[PDB]
Structures are given as structure tokens and as C-alpha cells.
Design a protein around this ligand. Sequence first.
Ligand code: A1AFV
Length: 259
Amino acid sequence: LLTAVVIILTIAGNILVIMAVSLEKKLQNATNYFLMSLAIADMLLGFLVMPVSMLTILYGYRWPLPSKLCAVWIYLDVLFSTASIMHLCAISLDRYVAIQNPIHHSRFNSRTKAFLKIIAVWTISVGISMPIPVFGLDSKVFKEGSCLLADDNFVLIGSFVSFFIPLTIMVITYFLTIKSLQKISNEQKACKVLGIVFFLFVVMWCPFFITNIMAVICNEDVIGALLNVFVWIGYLSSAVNPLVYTLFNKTYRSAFSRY
Ligand SMILES: CN(C)CCc1c[nH]c2ccccc12
């Protein structure tokens, strides 16, 4: 159905971002290397998890794949989602320390900061998702002919650290960054871009996490039919992070117009 366009555009945008990074020497700084790591974490979403959800949807929520890949597929989904969330959380914090005091950010501006930041966010993304192979693996991962999470203590308590803390950091960091920038037109264009990025992240991922948190804290068919669309809306963020984090730059616009 409409998810095929999501898969195709998720492939196309991330591939074009990777191709524009690879054969351009003007975009080789550390800030853009973190975005290359984001496109690495985002290419693998649309080819390893979303076709699996595709033929899960086309089979009427009865999974034709074998039962041995349920915990692995759930672990891949949680790993790529927490990676593509933590990437934006570290991007916002780096953007804050590069907006507040540019001198002390440019003092330590190197590839060492990018290596440490990528290592930290990937350690967080693996360490959040690592209990799913070792505690969920079939009652914690399989239910009624579909591969869905059912260990409610992990679904609630994992969503606290994997989303409601990095969302609290985006809230406090967007407040301080827009207060510092509000304290001229270049600055206001960055204010509009920051507002679009923040008000799209809290719109595209948040409904799934308040839906699953409310379903754990509490109408089962209504919550299931909401989850079956809000996961795909969560997948639509992977159709956007290649686009809206590069297309406001002139070099990336020229590179995309070249292809
Ligand atoms: C379905 N996908 C978007 C879930 C991503 C996710 C990140 N953290 C989680 C914690 C529990 C369940 C799912 C997730």
C-alpha cells in the first residue's frame, strides 16, 4: 500500500545523502561526519526492518517468517530507533554548545569529539537494545501469531531512558538554544530550522511512545490498530532525517540537483 513509497523514499534519500557525503571534500568536517553516521544508522532501517513489517502487514498480521528471528528483528528495530533518536539528541546538545559559546566549541572542534560522540551514542543504542537477545529470548516477544513486545516492565521502563530522558534533554536544550539565539536574519533562519526539527521529532516519534506507555499502564483492538499505524509513522522519520537535515544547506541542494 502506502508503505512501499515510504520504503522507496527511505532508500533513496539516505543513499543520496551517503553519495553526496562520499564524493564531496567540502563536507568532510566532524559535524557532517555525525550526520553520515546518522545516514548509516538510517539506511539499514528501510532494508532490514521495514520490508519485514511490509510482508507482515500484507499477510494480515500473521508472520510468515520463522519464529527464530522475532527477538532479532525486535532488537534490530529498537537498535535502529534508539540510534536514530540518540543521534538527534547529541546533535541538539552539540548545536547548543556551538550556539551558546562558539569560541569554546571551536577550541575543541576536531574529529576526536565526533569519534567520542558516535561511540557514546552507539554504546547507548546497543546497551538499550542488548537485553532483548538475552532476556526476551518466546513469551516476552511472541503473542497471538505476531511478533510484538509483551514484557511490559521493559516496554515502560526502557521508554523512560530511551525516549523520555532524551526528550527532556531536547526540551531543556531547545529552550536554552532558542533563548541564546533570541538574545540577525541568519540567526532567525537557524531558529526556524531548529523549530521545524524539534516540532517534527516530537510529532513523528512521540505518538508511538505515549501510545505504548499508555497501553502498558492500562480497548485492546483500538490500541493495536493505533500501534500498527504509529509504528509506520515512526518509520516515516527515516524518510525525513536524510532530507530535512541536509536540504537547508546549499551544497547538499546542489548535490541533489546534480542527481
Ligand atoms: C517500533 N520501533 C519504533 C520501536 C522503537 C523503540 C525504541 N525504544 C523502544 C523501547 C521499547 C519498544 C520499542 C522501542
